[PDB]
Amino acid sequence: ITTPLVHVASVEKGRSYEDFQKVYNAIALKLREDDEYDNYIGYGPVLVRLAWHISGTWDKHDNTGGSYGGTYRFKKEFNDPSNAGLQNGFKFLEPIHKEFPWISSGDLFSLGGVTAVQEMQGPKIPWRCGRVDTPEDTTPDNGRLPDADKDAGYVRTFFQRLNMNDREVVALMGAHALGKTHLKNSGYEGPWGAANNVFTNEFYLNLLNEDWKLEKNDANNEQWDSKSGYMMLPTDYSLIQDPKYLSIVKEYANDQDKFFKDFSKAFEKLLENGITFPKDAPSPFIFKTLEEQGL
Numbered sequence: 001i002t003t004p005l006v007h008v009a010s011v012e013k014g015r016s017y018e019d020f021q022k023v024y025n026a027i028a029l030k031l032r033e034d035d036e037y038d039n040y041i042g043y044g045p046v047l048v049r050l051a052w053h054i055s056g057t058w059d060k061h062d063n064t065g066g067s068y069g070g071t072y073r074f075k076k077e078f079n080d081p082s083n084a085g086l087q088n089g090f091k092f093l094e095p096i097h098k099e100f101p102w103i104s105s106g107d108l109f110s111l112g113g114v115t116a117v118q119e120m121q122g123p124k125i126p127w128r129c130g131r132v133d134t135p136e137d138t139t140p141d142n143g144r145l146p147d148a149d150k151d152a153g154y155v156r157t158f159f160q161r162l163n164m165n166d167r168e169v170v171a172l173m174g175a176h177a178l179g180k181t182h183l184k185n186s187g188y189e190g191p192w193g194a195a196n197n198v199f200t201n202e203f204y205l206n207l208l209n210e211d212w213k214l215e216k217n218d219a220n221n222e223q224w225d226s227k228s229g230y231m232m233l234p235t236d237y238s239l240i241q242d243p244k245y246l247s248i249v250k251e252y253a254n255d256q257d258k259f260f261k262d263f264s265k266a267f268e269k270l271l272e273n274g275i276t277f278p279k280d281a282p283s284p285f286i287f288k289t290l291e292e293q294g295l
């Protein structure tokens with residue numbers, strides 16, 4: 001009776017690679033322009049978190065949620081407590097959408113994350129168009145995104161719902177090299193590392209090389225703190241408490257190139273979960289950075 005929905009990707013009318021490269025460039029140029037945001041971190045990290053949160057609502061068992069429908073634009077999902085702070089990323093993308101009103105919301109949200117990773121010198125992320133806006137009654141209920149106050153067993157079980165295995169989980173969590181936690185958003189405070197708007201394997205290096213102490217923060221949540229001024233969420237630290245995760249953490253801490261390759265695959269997969277692509281669909285696009293274009 002409850003059969004899994006099938007969401008078929010549909011290319012926006014008469015649009016192709018050059019069209020989306022222009023959208024990429026507008027995102028990337030505004031990222032360069034609005035350098036002051038969040039004490040000069042810039043909008044890169046929040047756009048990556050936005051792309052992850054609009055995708056991480058997916059439930060593989062009935063194909064509800066996921067990036068396809070662009071449902072973060074609706075009040076119920078926009079106001080999810082797990083999404084506190086992402087309003088800044090939505091407001092950043094509003095002038096992009098006014099300039100390119102033909103792009104679907106899901107395509108714009110997911111492309112924002114790809115642009116941010118690449119412009120912060122991360123790996124190329126192949127990206128496919130064709131997400132189609134769906135009505136407000138398709139918006140997933142709050143509560144599908146993960147709790148940070150949990151252990152490795154919770155992390156492993158949670159990501160099963162997104163069809164992610166151990167390697168994919170550890171790779172995806174490496175995005176916590178970016179940005180920081182804000183007490184007002186999540187009840188956690190502090191960055192994970194020093195180079196907060198450059199995409200590197202710093203997350204794994206800090207996990208393994210810093211001396212961490214479990215401490216209460218000003219919101220009375222416990223987090224792991226180092227003397228360097230970095231922090232780790234409980235779920236972050238669980239990647240070195242669990243023996244299978246620890247092996248992969250060590251692998252990425254020693255080999256940023258392998259991390260980049262695995263992150264690129266898993267992040268594209270995360271953004272595409274729940275979408276059926278016709279065999280006649282165009283191949284994934286690899287957008288050029290502003291630097292590669294002399295822009």
Ligand code: HEM
Pocket residue numbers: 045046048049052084085146147148149155172173175176178179180181182183185186187188233235267
């Ligand atoms: C168990 C899984 C995860 C948990 C529990 C988690 C939790 C969190 C929390 C609590 C914050 C702080 C938000 C704030 O206070 O502003 C955060 C930020 C962030 N998350 Fe994660 N996250 C997870 C996985 C991911 C994944 C898979 C990605 C991307 C691939 C990601 C990307 C980010 C980024 C870039 C930030 C920084 C945002 C900013 O600086 O504004 N996270 N996450």
